[PDB]
């Protein structure tokens, strides 16, 4: 396929808890000084998410290919804009209409085309010694691009392309969604200043833009870059320096939250309905502080542990070839009568011996007939 | 135009940022089937659509009536999935002059059946096989399993139900975002502090236009008050926000 990469010390992962993230503006309805709730793909409070290590200074460059579950929340605690790419696709063999989002050194390129892919595509920048120059040297993303469907190129701008190491100074919050095929992006830059796993606090989420794609997304990938300098042995397949990065990924669930808005109509307080018994009580009466008392809730429900089928031992087959075009049938005034019982009947088997013209089952849909016992 | 794709590899086209019309559809070719599900054809130019997607293919007349949002069938279950809440239009028209050869059409192919079920807006790129019950065969031209792709037999000597109908479905949404695909009605001057009728991208009504007092993100179109009616509107051209009373 393509080149491989080595010296990867793949260490066991660590589960870390979250604090009050994943609350955005759901739709167009501007709401000021009024509480509201909706049933949509959201993020629960206090969830045990998985964090992948990316510090090289060590020797870790991990980007697993996770299937695209409905709803994705992303939170990157960056310091030098390490994450630049995302890929969407199912087969990655220049036949699937794959989508590449890249924060290129000049533009922000969003390309929906037939790219042929390798095992672990990535990006790499080489740092010269005589001059402090940063420029995109290795672009190991796709092998061929024959069929295309969408192209967007952002404005030509320049970034610093830092290669520094230290503490996390920026937080990028993204939402990856799939509604009717669309791809809504909710981007938020946050001036954070810590060294390690996500801190507490909460703020509203600002949607960025809805990419009007309509292609299937079943698998996805978040991409990374690398640094090349004198510290490397002198090659790219084994010599590589990543840096230090941290990102969090969370699958979204069909949740519901009550939202608080001020006179300026801004998301300030959000509360759940199904996180503890108190949450439903708070969002039932459409307030935050409720007076001392007791209030009606839902009732306990039991999910069926099994779903069994109980039919009698019947093996006989209903003869329908004799019913449909066997040798000869009678007239209408002396209408031909046939009795059928004690056998299995089907409707999908009616489209083999002869193609029919009119087929109308009065009151009964043709799809359910095998599910009832006549 | 010149040639369209098959149904299993359905042709996708993206249309936006232009004016659309329905009365202009009756000039280049006279159509046969034209059914806009849920939407009357007379009102389409009066609404302002977003993200037009055209799915184009060619099928036999024996399955044209089957393509509809919510039924079953050979093609409706295993080749494409029309959503039940979906709002759009479907147009089918016969094409004998280009999709009907004297020796028959063999270039195009069609998949009668598929292994698993479908999801909305899905294209399959696998030649995997249909094989009786469970435990697949994987298929290499032998009997009592089923390779998915067969070829058509369209000749001018075939029947009416055996005619090649080009089918194109137009898909869109409404009342969800600032649109740009709306039509040939011309705008006029903007009047403030008066009880007048108004129109913004197909959204009509009567009220008073006043000045707003809040910062809004530059991708919001309409705000709804506690009564769920529109009380804030963004100007289509000056991009100023006006309150409705």
């Amino acid at each position: 396929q393509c080149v491989n990469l080595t010296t990867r010390t793949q260490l066991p992962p660590a589960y870390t808890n979250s604090f009050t993230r994943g609350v955005y503006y759901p739709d167009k309805v501007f709401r000021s000084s009024v509480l509201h709730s909706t049933q949509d793909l959201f993020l629960p409070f206090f969830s045990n998410v998985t964090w992948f290590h990316a510090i090289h200074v060590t020797k870790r460059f991990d980007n697993p290919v996770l299937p695209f579950n409905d709803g994705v929340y992303f939170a990157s605690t960056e310091k030098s804009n390490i994450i630049r790419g995302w890929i969407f696709g199912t087969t990655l063999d220049s036949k699937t209409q794959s989508l590449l989002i890249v924060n290129n050194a000049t533009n922000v390129v969003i390309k929906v085309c037939e790219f042929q892919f390798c095992n672990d595509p990535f990006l790499g920048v080489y740092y010269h010694k005589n001059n402090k120059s940063w420029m995109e040297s290795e672009f190991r993303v796709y092998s061929s691009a024959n069929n295309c469907t969408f192209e967007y190129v952002s404005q030509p701008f320049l970034m610093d392309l830092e290669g520094k190491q230290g503490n996390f100074k920026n937080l990028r919050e993204f939402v990856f969604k799939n509604i009717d095929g669309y791809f809504k992006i909710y981007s938020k830059h946050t001036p954070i200043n810590l060294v390690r796993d996500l801190p507490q606090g909460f703020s509203a989420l600002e949607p960025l833009v809805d990419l009007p794609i309509g292609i299937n997304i079943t698998r996805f990938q978040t991409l990374l870059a690398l640094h090349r300098s004198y510290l490397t042995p002198g090659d790219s397949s084994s010599g590589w320096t990543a840096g230090a990065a941290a990102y969090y990924v969370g699958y979204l669930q069909p949740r519901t939250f009550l939202l608080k808005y001020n006179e300026n109509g801004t998301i300030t307080d959000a509360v759940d309905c199904a996180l503890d018994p108190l949450s439903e009580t708070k969002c039932t009466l459409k307030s935050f502080t409720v007076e001392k008392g007791i209030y009606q809730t839902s009732n306990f429900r039991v999910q069926p542990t099994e779903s069994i089928v109980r039919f009698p031992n019947i093996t006989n087959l209903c003869p329908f070839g004799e019913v449909f075009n066997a040798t000869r049938f009678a007239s209408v005034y002396a209408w031909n009568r046939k009795r059928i019982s004690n056998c299995v009947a089907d409707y999908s088997v009616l489209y083999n011996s002869a193609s029919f013209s009119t087929f109308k089952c009065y009151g009964v849909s043709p799809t359910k007939l095998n599910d009832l016992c006549f | 135009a010149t040639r369209f794709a098959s149904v299993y590899a359905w042709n996708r086209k993206r249309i936006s940022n232009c004016v659309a019309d329905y009365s202009v559809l009756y000039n280049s070719a006279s159509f046969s089937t034209f059914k806009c599900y849920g939407v009357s054809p007379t009102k389409l130019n009066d609404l302002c659509f977003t993200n037009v997607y055209a799915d184009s293919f060619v099928i036999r007349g024996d399955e044209v009536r089957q393509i509809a949002p919510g039924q079953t069938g050979k093609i409706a279950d295993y080749n494409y999935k029309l959503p039940d809440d979906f709002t759009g239009c479907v147009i089918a028209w016969n094409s004998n002059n280009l999709d009907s050869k004297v020796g028959g059409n063999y270039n195009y192919l069609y998949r009668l059946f598929r292994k698993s079920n479908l999801k909305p807006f899905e294209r399959d790129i696998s030649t995997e096989i249909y094989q009786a019950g469970s435990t697949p065969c994987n298929g290499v031209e032998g009997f009592n399993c089923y390779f998915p792709l067969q070829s058509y037999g369209f000749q001018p000597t075939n029947g009416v139900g055996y005619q090649p109908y080009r089918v194109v479905v137009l898909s869109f949404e409404l009342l969800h975002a600032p649109a740009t695909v709306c039509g040939p009605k011309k705008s006029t001057n903007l009047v403030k502090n008066k009880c007048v009728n108004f129109n913004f991208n197909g959204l009509t009504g009567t009220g008073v236009l006043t000045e707003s007092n809040k910062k809004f993100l530059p991708f919001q179109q309409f705000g709804r008050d506690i009564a769920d009616t529109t009380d804030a509107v963004r100007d289509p051209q000056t991009l100023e926000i006006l309150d409705i009373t």
Partner: antibody, heavy 127, light 111 residues
Framework: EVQLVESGGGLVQPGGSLRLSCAAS????????MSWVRQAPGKGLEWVSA???????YYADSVKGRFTISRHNPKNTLYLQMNSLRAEDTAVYYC?????????????????????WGQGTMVTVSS | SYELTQPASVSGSPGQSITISCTGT?????????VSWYQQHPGKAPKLMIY???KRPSGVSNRFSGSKSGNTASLTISGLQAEDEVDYYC??????????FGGGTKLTVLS
């Protein structure tokens, strides 16, 4: 050593019964294969005898109430108490093998490979 | 009493390829797979040459093959020799672990 041997052949008259047998040698019938293919020279064939032990609902809708058969695993031999033998059953049967999916022969695949047979017996139901 | 359609008389020149079929119905088109082809010198128990239609028998010359699509068949017997004038059958499913197969294609080698 490993061989399927048919035994228990005798004369059958209308109204009588007889106990046939297919004995495996080398491999025990407790965890092995037995497929009873019924052959009439010159025409098509049919696999009929539906005895996979455990005694649940698995039968063919052609010999209902006619072919009764028992299981004996440790003795490495199966007996066929073919009751109500019809005079139109003039055919020499063969107990044979198959292939499934479990062991090293199939890790990915389907199976179904009859590969080891018997020699058959000569039993005639004549009035 | 249960019997399915096969082409009884088939013949082919040595070194050529011949196609063998056995008939089923629409209740056998969705997604099953069970077809194993036979071989009989007349008058004795059969011989296994092809099973698991497009995969590998343990010890068998790889000149024989099978191919699978729709109502369009092949047991592809290629590289015919003088010892191929033998009887042939298939196998097939009948639903709920039941079984049925075809009516004995008989091959005659010419030349």
């Amino acid at each position: 050593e490993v061989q399927l041997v048919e035994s228990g052949g005798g004369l059958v008259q209308p109204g009588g019964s007889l106990r046939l047998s297919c004995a495996a040698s080398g491999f025990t019938v407790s965890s092995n294969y037995m497929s009873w293919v019924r052959q009439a020279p010159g025409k098509g064939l049919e696999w009929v005898s539906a005895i996979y032990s455990g005694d649940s609902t698995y039968y063919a809708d052609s010999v209902k109430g006619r072919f009764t058969i028992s299981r004996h695993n440790p003795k490495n031999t199966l007996y066929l108490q073919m009751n109500s033998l019809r005079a139109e059953d003039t055919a020499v049967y063969y107990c044979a093998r198959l292939v499934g999916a479990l062991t090293n022969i199939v890790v990915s695949g389907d199976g179904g490979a009859f590969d080891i047979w018997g020699q058959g017996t000569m039993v005639t139901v004549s009035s | 009493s249960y019997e399915l359609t096969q082409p009884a008389s088939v013949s082919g020149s040595p070194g050529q390829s011949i196609t063998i079929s056995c008939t089923g119905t629409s209740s056998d088109v969705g997604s099953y797979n069970l077809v194993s082809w036979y071989q009989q010198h007349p008058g004795k128990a059969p011989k296994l040459m092809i099973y698991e239609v497009s995969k590998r028998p343990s010890g068998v010359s790889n000149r024989f093959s099978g191919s699978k699509s729709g109502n369009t068949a092949s047991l592809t017997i290629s590289g015919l020799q003088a010892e191929d004038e033998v009887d042939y059958y298939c196998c097939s499913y009948a639903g709920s672990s039941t079984w049925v197969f075809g009516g004995g294609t008989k091959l005659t080698v010419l030349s």
